Design a protein around this ligand. Structure first.
Ligand SMILES: *[C@@H]1O[C@H](CO)[C@@H](O)[C@H](O)[C@H]1NC(C)=O
Lengths: 50, 99, 49
């Protein structure tokens, strides 16, 4: 504890994501909306918008 | 105002041992990368050592104005090299005030 | 757990000791690196070994 501020211990957590190529297993808390077809809509399919 | 300059030449400069000498966070360099200082090599190395306060560490940079950068210690616009700064509370501070 | 000099080494495209011999990140890395000080938990007056 008597060392300098650059010699202090540091706890590191590295969250390594990987982008969606497989079916998504971990996803954030967003409420799903019922599907409608044959209409000009905004879609949000597993994070990708359009 | 009377900063010391030390000329370093004719020796093998290992920059990885600097991290053991002083407890600084970042080896902040400007024209060169801090991790590539062992492969490439130079002609002369100068070390300028002085003491300032924490509001004025950001003034030691190419292209700043203020008190240190305008009147005490000015860096050139095409400056290549590293600036190392660390806190010195436990050695360079007194309860009565440093003069 | 590392020391404060090598927190800058946990980044893509870095060398040194941690990034060269202990824990190397890829150049196309995506994600977040979270670090905080742990002086109250990983330090002893006799020395943490
Ligand atoms: C600085 O030099 C003194 C005297 O040689 C020595 O006792 C001390 O351990 C040195 N500090 C470091 C960090 O090397």
């Amino acid at each position: 504890p008597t060392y300098g501020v650059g010699h202090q211990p540091y706890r590191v957590v590295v969250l390594s994501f990987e982008l969606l190529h497989a079916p998504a297993t971990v996803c954030g808390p967003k409420k799903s909306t019922n599907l409608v077809k044959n209409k000009c809509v905004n879609f949000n399919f597993n994070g990708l918008t359009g | 105002y009377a900063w010391n300059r030390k000329r370093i030449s004719n020796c093998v400069a290992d920059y990885s041992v600097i991290y053991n000498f002083a407890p600084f966070f970042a080896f902040k360099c400007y024209g060169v990368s801090p991790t590539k200082l062992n492969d490439l090599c130079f002609t002369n190395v100068y070390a300028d050592s002085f003491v300032i306060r924490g509001n004025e560490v950001s003034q030691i940079a190419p292209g700043q104005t203020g008190n240190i950068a305008d009147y005490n210690y000015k860096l050139p616009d095409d400056f290549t090299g590293c600036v190392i700064a660390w806190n010195s509370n436990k050695l360079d501070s007194k309860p009565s005030g440093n003069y």
